[PDB]
Amino acid sequence: MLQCYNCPNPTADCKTAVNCSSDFDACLITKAGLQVYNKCWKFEHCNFNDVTTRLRENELTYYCCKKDLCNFNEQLE
Amino acid sequence: MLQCYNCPNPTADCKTAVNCSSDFDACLITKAGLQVYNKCWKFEHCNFNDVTTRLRENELTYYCCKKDLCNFNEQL
Amino acid sequence: YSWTWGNXXXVXGX
Ligand SMILES: [Zn+2]
């Protein structure tokens, strides 16, 4: 399966690694202000609109990828 | 109004600047193998699936943005 | 603010 950093809640540095279930095909990371999210995610729905609405956030940058444990914080500068 | 580099066909260095009509809200650039595309585009349709099918290309990197003349080659 | 970059891949966004 695909392995992502995945923290139920925003954290300054999530190091909780999970096997995402088959439904999820990508790993997300996104900073919204000082807050940081790390999640199992779907590639189709990795974009400003999908991410902002699904996480209830106004302004963010995001990165998604499909390699194990790729959604680490240094991916966003 | 939005100004993009826009070349009817892939070119190694597109120098054609166009006033995209209001139907387009973004400028695209994408390298697909050795080929390079620069186009007026729609942000909705800026992603691997939409770009590969609309240009008939298998493997590429793309970048889209909305400022005038932003879709230059060094963006990738 | 609003730009997208990507691959594959690979998605990079504003
Ligand atoms: Zn090609």
Min Cα–Cα distance to chain B from C9, Å? 9
Phi and psi torsions of B71, nearest 5°: -90, 60
Contact assessment for residue B42 and residue B24, using Cβ atoms and an 8 Å cutoff: yes
The reply to whether residue C14 touches residue A63, judged by beta carbons under 8 angstroms, is no
The reply to whether residue B47 touches residue C4, judged by beta carbons under 8 angstroms, is yes
Phi and psi torsions of A51, nearest 5°: -70, -45
Burial class from Cβ neighbours inside 10 Å (0-12, 13-18, 19+) for residue B43 reads buried
Contact assessment for residue B46 and residue B39, using Cβ atoms and an 8 Å cutoff: no
For A5, the token pair is 């950093």
Q: How many CB atoms lie within 10 A of CB A31?
A: 18
Query: What is the rounded CA–CA span in Å between residue C14 and residue A46?
Result: 11
**β-strands B61-65, B35-41 pairing:** unpaired
What residues does A19 pair with on adjacent strands?
A3
Phi and psi torsions of A34, nearest 5°: -85, -5
**Residue B10 CB-half CA count within 13 A:** 12
Contact assessment for residue A75 and residue A37, using Cβ atoms and an 8 Å cutoff: no
A62 closest CA partner among A76, A44, A49:
A76
How many whole angstroms from its chain centre is CA B27?
A: 5
Q: All domains of chain B, ordered by start, with CATH?
A: 3-75 (2.10.60.10)
Query: What is the rounded CA–CA span in Å between residue B3 and residue B8?
Result: 15
Q: Chain A interface, mutation test: which of C11, C12, C14, most A Cβ atoms within 10 Å?
A: C11
For A45, the token pair is 């729905």
Q: How many CB atoms lie within 10 A of CB A37?
A: 24
**In units of Å, what resolution does this entry have?**
2.4
